[PDB]
Paper text:
It assembles planar sheets as well as 3D rings and helical polymers, all implicated in mitigating plastid-associated membrane stress. PspA activity is triggered by agents that threaten inner membrane integrity, including phage, mislocalized secretins, and antibiotics, whereas Vipp1 is a plastid component in cyanobacteria, algae, and plants, in which it functions in thylakoid membrane biogenesis and repair.
Alternatively, Vipp1Δα61–219 assembled with related but different lattices, termed Vipp1Δα6_L2 and Vipp1Δα6_L3. Only helical parameters with a rise of 2.16 Å and a rotation of 85.50° yielded a 3.7 Å-resolution map, with excellent side chain detail enabling model building from amino acids 1–217. Specifically, Vipp1 formed ESCRT-III-like protofilaments, in which hairpin motifs packed side by side and the α5C of subunit j bound across the hairpin tip of subunit j+3 to form the classical interface 1 domain swop. These protofilaments formed a 17-start right-handed helix that ran diagonally around the helical axis. Concurrently, each hairpin tip bound the N terminus of helix 5 (α5N) in a neighboring protofilament, thereby forming interface 3. Neighboring protofilaments aligned laterally to form a 4-start left-handed helix, in which subunits connected through the stacking of helices α0 and the formation of interface 2. The 4-start helix has a pitch of 44 Å and forms diagonal parallel ridges that encircle the helical axis and dominate the surface topology of the Vipp1 helical filament.
Numbering used by the authors:
A (entry chain A): 166 to 217
B (entry chain A), C (entry chain A), D (entry chain A): 1 to 55
E (entry chain A): 111 to 165
F (entry chain A), G (entry chain A): 56 to 110
Write the structure that this text describes.
Amino acid sequence: SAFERMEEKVLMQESRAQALGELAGADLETQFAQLEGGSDVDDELAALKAQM
Amino acid sequence: MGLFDRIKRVVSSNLNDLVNKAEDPEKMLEQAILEMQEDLVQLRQGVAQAIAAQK
Amino acid sequence: MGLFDRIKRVVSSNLNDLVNKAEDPEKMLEQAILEMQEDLVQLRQGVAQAIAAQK
Amino acid sequence: MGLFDRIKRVVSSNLNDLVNKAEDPEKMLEQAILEMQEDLVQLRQGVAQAIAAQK
Amino acid sequence: QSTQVETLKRNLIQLESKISEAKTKKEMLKARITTAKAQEQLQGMVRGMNTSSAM
Amino acid sequence: RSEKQYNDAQNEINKWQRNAQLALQKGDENLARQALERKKTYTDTSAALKASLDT
Amino acid sequence: RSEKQYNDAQNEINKWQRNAQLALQKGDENLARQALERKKTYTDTSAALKASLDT
């Protein structure tokens, strides 16, 4: 029990620190940036495979 | 008791004018802003707690 | 008796928060593991007794 | 208590302007960077601990 | 007697597995703690909040 | 300085409208909803700030 | 100095792309994945830095 409660406390602390960002409003910026940056690696790998 | 109230009101007026002489708008106008922001900080932390609970 | 219960609940909440302030996850997360292992030791000894009886 | 608060606010404004006079942007702009890097160091150490656990 | 000893040994094996899992989680959460203790020094980097005196 | 702040707010309004364009192109309806919701607040802030820049 | 940093980042982007070439030739898919992942961050950094070099 004293292990589960401590795990919960740590998870809550991390959740608070992280949510302090979505409060800042950077979640939309991150989503938009990752909507373009995510597939670059796969596209480059496919193009390089085609070249080779 | 109808006289000590009057005496204390006179003393309070003396002290309040002695203070209102010292207030200087240039510095007070900035201390007020400082304290307003310092309280906005705590409000932000509260909203953070709420969003963490939702998460 | 409908008031002493309330008083004791208030006192208990005071003490419980005063304690939950002191708990520190870094050390508690290790004390829990220590005690779990310390009990596994006794369980091992019990199984040893059982196997000795079988022998 | 409605007067001591005012007195302490006046004193605080005096001190805060006396300090804000001393701040010099050229040196503060570098102390801020120094402290930011000093904290990034500890964050790096934390990530190191995490990766070691994974290993 | 042998039948019973079999179950006892199986239970001990399960005990050891559970303790191992708990010991892994402890090391994970310790790194989580040491990271979150300074991740605030990322999250203060935004231009809005003043929760990070460094910025 | 006040007019510079006005200009910055006006720029970011159109920035968020364009990002809503991009979301609607490649993303979904919820992302465009969020972008438009932010752009609404930005436009309100810009109008309120110009209201004082005039005086 | 800022433009020199831009140049260095731009150089290392192509360096990592070439090393991904080499990995795909002689190595495996995971090595190329890692190289491309690093090159993505380098390109992002280069673009962000030029965005300020302009001003």
